[PDB]
């Protein structure tokens, strides 16, 4: 019925790392249909997903 | 005057009826007793099946506005010896114990009459420490020992070491998270290779201890990579040794077993309960639920949240094999989508591997699980589940391993940023340069979700299958998927892992609550104001969870493993306590 | 005669394909 | 108009106060069981919701199933006409 | 396959196509304590309710099958709805078996589970039966097939064989609900006309207890019972799944038999699945204060709600504190027919 | 000491009169639910029992594809 | 069956340890300064962490077994190099064996519970909550008059 909580990651990667690879497949997204905290961690959930694919493609 | 011996082997002609092994006679002498016993227990009789299958709602809803704390008969046995158990006042306790084979429990009368209902002892360790003292537990391993002629490989010095191995309140939770995102593959684990690599040297160097032995995987991994010269010397062979010992005891076990059969399959499976394949591990990250229901006569009931599968035709409909990791490639995001976009309470799909094909028939991890490891360690820890998310998200939104263009071999600890990561590799201190941490990232493509518990529930053997109540037949077992068993947590470890691992008293030797109240905080108020429940034998555990009747180790087991001396006598009376109690264990024990 | 290969090989492609759409669809619920 | 008494033992009368007349009832056994089945009622409530939603996903998903098959099936058809 | 060709020349005679099945022991399990059964078959229908006479189903257990991999009782299901033709099947339609030895436990199944996977499986001289000869020569794995159960979530293994045209006519059928959608709300239809009827009981009265049963009760019976607590009197209609367990049919079963007493009893709170249709006994030479020792160990049950029902026509509620309501029982004779017809003859 | 109320049959119930009319009304609610819970469960089994015969269907006609 | 972690050899260190006429004052300082909790604890970590580790060296014997909370801090803050192994084992020892002592009090106290409450702080003074320990650094009082 819950999960747990969540855990701290302070600041943004996609605000200090533009030079990342990844970046141009992160926009897939959307906003308009959650709001804003939940988009929130659901963008944190694509980017550890993506980061773990850059990570096994090399 | 001639000296006639009067072995257990002429007793066989008695010991080896049916007639001693049905309670029909002493169920039907119960029911009709004109007074039975007002004293009702109703903590552990019938495991009751959950409709979610999150196990964290079932712990947290379990301890919450919690204030009753009651407590099973069988374990209100072994706490008091021989000579106050045949006391007087101790009637109401001796009223129901009436037969070695089955310890009869009343239940309630919630219906119309309350039945005196009989389960079956399964093993010769679950009679009570009064009519069964540990000392001559001891002394049957010890005689056990010269039976066999047993090889102890292991000395009193790795005991010893993995005693205070899971005595160490600052173990790193970081080995935590190795062993989950690893969790029991071959092709995981070679990814890792410069990771544990120096995860165990370094703690080597630190606390001069060892590290990873919560896990049979990870122990049986180290066996088989890394002896080229990766860890130190000294460190590789504590590995080494625990590994012979098992395949030592499961070679003495296969000697008291003996080289007969029965039909065509073999009688190791009813003298012994490690050597029976229908005991399963506590804890399985490989599929072995399809591989039982092959195997198996007995039939036997995988329920996954009253989700029956118990034929073996159901295979992917209940449970799908994740497979290796090269040909997931095509549905990683299918996966992800799965993950973010699936409905985790009532979904009773297994996400496992395929069942690994080894000569040794699953025996080693079952007596890693069962007699080595609560005994060397006397019982005191606990399975806890991880959250794959979670720590995907800790490995993965930090610095280094984010940007690749962060150099491999720099230190992580000087430039990942302040989150839990940092506080995870603080309190541990360990080095691991980034690199070896994004394959550990990477790993996440094909993790599972979440650690589900599932109640197999395996019918008995047809020698001790005579009860007339045909749901007490099963005895059903626990078995946590997916999470690893772990040891005590520190109060620094607790607050910066809440985040990560939720704590689940799942068994008789691994629910404990000296380190569940560790890690989690409902348990840490549960016996603040139970402190008799303290004792691993009087833990409360959620029946639906957890069924302590209808269990394969009872109550005196958690009693014999709490207080033996960590050694060599120790571990091989726990293993001569795993006998059986059939007739042609009986047999089989005359022999020897 | 080289028709009777290649659109042999694709409809068993797709015949397997078919059940595993079913076994997402078991998959789904 | 009833009369308060502590005991009596083992009548043959029928209205006559005993200890097998007593009703043996526990108050806090009771209380907990009702605290937890009214939580469990609680709980089953909420599961008739929205399985409208999952029926609408099942329906799209045959849909997109069957679009698979409407398209296999002609091209199927084309590649055998090509004999004559 | 002993029962396979027991009842396939006896059944013959009430039911043209017969099937032979299997049931686990696991699953049938709940349905009876100990196994105490060792058939009455009576298929209802979905759309066309009406009844059926009853066909006598010769099952025999403690044997195994072929398969060494489970091992449970044997059974066979006549069909006999598909009016004349068979070769229309009638989907979601069930069948309900009364399987017994000395009438206990009662089975449910499709059509649709049974067809589904009988075609996934795929001077004198003495008379020789015909059928046990064919039978005897199949004897292989495949004959068994395991499907699983839409009312109980356990595989039903079926064993069907290409034996004859009796069976070679069976997997050539198909065709183009409702059936357990009536007995459920027929059931809570008499539940709720029942608690209208201890309604309007305790409403011409005062609201107050005559209490038929003595027993003592302590002056916390209004604490530790809360005011107007009612939660087992409100939940018991929910409680009530099953009826021809229940004790509410056993005074219409019993009332051409003369006239005794039976019990429904629940749990205050979700104790457990209590007891259903038992009987108060005033027959034996435990005699009428034998049953009144029943009836007092009844008052005296201090966690169960109870329900009683005479053979003559009248129904009663014993609240847990020997509190009784009285009512009344008497319904359409109609639904007494369908009920009795439901049961066995007339 | 304990007080027991000794048993007449001028002991009545504490007075109910508010107790049944919601009682029963929230009970047909629960019960609708029950039902449509086990309607659910129902439609879930009927649909993967008819779901291997339109499977066992297209593997009897994958019998054709062989000599084609 | 009460097993012993602590061995003899720790119980002479923490002997000569208080048998030291030469004990560092400014662990007392510390201890005036550090009192009770641990945010306070974590502020001062290399401080402690260096002044245990230099008189693990000038002498041989330990220090800050005068307090048990730091007792406490110290087998649960430390242990990650900041002080010595042979040093960090006496402290884990001793915290080992005060738990191993609570459980031997737990398997004598036994299962038995007279209304819903365990006989422990009846057969036992050491485990009634009613009896406190002499240094005291928290709400022990107000706590201690809800549970009694």
Redesign the interface.
Same mark, same amino acid.
């Given at each position: 019925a819950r999960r747990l909580p969540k855990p701290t990651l302070q600041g943004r990667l996609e605000a200090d790392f533009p030079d990342s690879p990844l970046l141009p497949k992160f926009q897939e997204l959307n906003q308009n249909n959650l709001p804003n905290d939940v988009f929130r961690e659901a963008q944190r959930s694509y980017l550890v997903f993506l980061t773990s694919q850059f990570c096994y493609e090399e | 005057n001639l000296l006639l011996a009067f072995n257990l082997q002429n007793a066989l002609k008695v010991l080896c009826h049916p007639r001693l092994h049905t309670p029909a006679h002493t169920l039907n002498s119960l029911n009709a007793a004109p007074a039975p016993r007002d004293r009702r227990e109703?903590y552990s009789l019938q495991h009751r099946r959950p +409709?979610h299958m999150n196990v964290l709602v079932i712990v947290d809803?379990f301890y919450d +506005?919690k204030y009753?704390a009651p407590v099973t008969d069988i374990a209100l046995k072994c706490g008091l010896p021989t000579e106050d158990f045949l006391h007087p006042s101790n009637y109401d306790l001796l009223r129901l114990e009436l037969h070695p084979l089955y310890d009869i429990y009343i239940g309630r009368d919630a219906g119309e009459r309350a039945r005196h209902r009989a389960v079956h002892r399964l093993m010769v360790g679950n009679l009570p420490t009064p009519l069964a003292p540990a000392a001559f537990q001891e002394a049957r391993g010890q005689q056990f020992e010269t039976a066999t002629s047993l090889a102890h490989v292991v000395d009193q010095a790795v005991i010893e070491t993995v005693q205070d191995t899971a005595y160490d309140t600052a173990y790193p939770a970081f080995f935590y998270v190795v062993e989950a995102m690893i969790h029991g593959f071959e092709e995981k684990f070679v990814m890792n290779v410069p990771l544990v690599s120096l995860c165990i040297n370094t703690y080597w160097e630190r606390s001069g201890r060892l590290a990873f032995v919560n896990s049979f995987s990870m122990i049986k991994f180290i066996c088989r990579h890394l002896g080229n010269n990766a860890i130190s010397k000294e460190a590789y062979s504590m590995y080494r040794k625990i590994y012979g010992e098992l395949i030592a005891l499961e070679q003495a076990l296969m000697r008291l077993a003996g080289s007969d059969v029965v039909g065509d399959e073999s009688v190791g499976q009813y003298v012994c309960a490690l050597l029976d394949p229908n005991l399963l591990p506590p804890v399985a990250y490989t599929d072995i639920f399809t591989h039982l229901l092959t195997v198996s006569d007995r039939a036997p009931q995988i329920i996954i949240g009253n989700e029956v599968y118990a034929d073996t035709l159901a295979a992917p409909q209940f449970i799908e094999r994740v497979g290796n990791m090269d040909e997931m490639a095509a549905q990683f995001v299918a996966l992800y989508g799965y993950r973010v976009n699936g409905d985790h309470d009532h979904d009773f799909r297994l996400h496992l591997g395929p069942y690994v094909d080894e000569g040794h028939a699953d025996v080693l991890e079952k007596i890693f699980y069962y007699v080595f490891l609560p005994t060397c360690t006397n019982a005191h820890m606990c399975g806890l589940g991880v959250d794959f998310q979670h720590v995907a998200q800790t490995l993965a939104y930090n610095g280094p391993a984010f940007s690749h263009h962060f150099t491999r071999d720099e230190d992580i600890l000087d430039n990942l940023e302040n989150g839990t990561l940092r506080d995870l590799l603080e309190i541990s201190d360990l080095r691991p340069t980034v690199g070896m941490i994004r394959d550990l990232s990477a790993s996440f493509m094909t993790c599972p979700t979440f650690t589900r518990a599932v109640r197999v529930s395996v019918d008995n053997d047809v020698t001790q299958q005579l009860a007339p109540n045909p749901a007490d037949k099963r005895t059903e077992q626990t078995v946590l998927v997916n999470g690893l068993v772990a040891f005590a947590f520190s109060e620094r470890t607790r607050a910066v892992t809440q985040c990560l691992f939720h704590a689940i008293p799942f068994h008789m030797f691994y629910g404990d609550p000296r380190v569940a109240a560790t890690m989690h905080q409902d348990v840490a108020t549960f016996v603040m104001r139970n402190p008799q429940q303290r004792a691993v034998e009087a833990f409360n555990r959620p029946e639906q969870l957890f069924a302590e009747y209808r269990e394969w180790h009872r109550s005196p087991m958690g009693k014999y493993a709490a207080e033996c001396l960590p050694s060599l006598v120790s571990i091989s009376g726990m293993t001569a306590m795993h006998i059986k109690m059939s007739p042609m264990a009986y047999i089989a024990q005359a022999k020897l | 005669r080289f028709?009777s290969q290649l659109?042999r090989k694709l409809?068993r492609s797709?015949h397997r394909?078919?059940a595993d759409?079913?076994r997402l669809?078991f998959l789904?619920? | 108009?009833? $009369? @308060?008494? =502590?005991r009596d033992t083992g009548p043959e009368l029928?209205? $006559? =106060?005993?200890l097998?007349?007593?009703? @043996?009832?526990? =108050?806090?056994?009771? &209380?907990?069981? &009702?605290?937890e089945?009214? *939580?469990?009622?609680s709980?089953?409530?909420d *599961?008739?919701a929205q399985?409208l939603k999952?029926r609408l996903?099942?329906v799209e998903?045959?849909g997109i199933?069957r679009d698979?098959?409407a398209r $296999?099936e002609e091209i199927?058809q084309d590649?055998?006409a090509?004999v004559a | 396959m002993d029962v396979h060709i027991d009842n396939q020349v006896l059944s013959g005679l009430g039911t043209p196509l017969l099937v032979h099945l299997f049931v686990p022991d696991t699953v049938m399990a709940e349905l009876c304590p100990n196994r105490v059964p060792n058939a009455w078959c009576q298929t209802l229908f979905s759309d066309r309710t009406g009844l059926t006479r009853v066909c006598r189903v010769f099952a025999a257990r403690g044997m195994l099958p072929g398969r060494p991999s489970h091992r449970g009782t044997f059974t066979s299901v006549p069909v006999y709805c598909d009016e004349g033709l068979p070769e229309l099947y009638n989907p979601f339609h069930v069948a309900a078996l009364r399987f017994y030895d000395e009438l206990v436990g009662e089975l449910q199944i499709y059509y649709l589970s049974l067809f589904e996977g009988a075609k996934r499986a795929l001077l004198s001289r003495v008379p020789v039966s015909f059928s046990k000869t064919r039978r005897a020569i199949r004897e292989s794995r495949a004959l068994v097939r395991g499907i699983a159960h839409i009312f109980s979530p356990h595989a039903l293994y079926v064993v069907t064989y290409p034996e004859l045209s009796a069976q070679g006519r069976l997997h050539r059928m198909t065709a183009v609900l409702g059936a357990p959608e009536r007995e459920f709300r027929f059931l809570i239809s008499v539940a709720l006309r029942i608690s209208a009827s201890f309604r309007e009981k305790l409403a011409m009265q005062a609201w107050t207890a005559q209490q038929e049963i003595?027993?003592?009760?302590?002056?916390?019976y209004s604490?530790?019972y809360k005011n107007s607590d009612l939660?087992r009197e409100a939940?018991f209609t929910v409680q009530t799944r099953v009826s021809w367990e229940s004790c509410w049919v056993k005074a219409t079963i019993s009332n051409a038999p003369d006239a005794c007493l039976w019990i429904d009893s629940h749990?205050?709170?979700?104790?457990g699945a209590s007891a259903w249709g038992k009987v108060i006994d005033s027959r034996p030479p435990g005699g009428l204060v034998g049953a009144?020792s029943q009836l007092?160990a009844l %008052?005296?049950?201090?966690?169960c709600v109870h329900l009683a029902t005479t053979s003559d026509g009248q129904a009663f509620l014993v609240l847990? %504190? %020997?509190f009784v309501i009285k009512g009344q029982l008497a319904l359409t004779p109609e639904e007494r027919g369908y009920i009795l017809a439901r049961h066995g003859i007339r």
């Open positions: - | 109703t +409709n809803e +506005n009753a | 028709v659109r409809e797709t394909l078919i759409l079913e669809k789904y619920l | 108009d009833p $009369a @308060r008494l =502590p029928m209205w $006559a =106060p005993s097998r007349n007593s009703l @043996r009832v526990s =108050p806090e056994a009771l &209380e907990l069981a &009702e605290r089945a009214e *939580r469990a009622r709980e089953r409530w *599961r008739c399985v999952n996903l099942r998903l045959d199933m698979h098959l $296999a199927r590649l055998d090509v | 003595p027993v003592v009760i302590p002056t916390s604490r530790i939660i939940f749990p205050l709170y979700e104790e009144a007092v %008052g005296t049950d201090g966690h847990p %504190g %020997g």
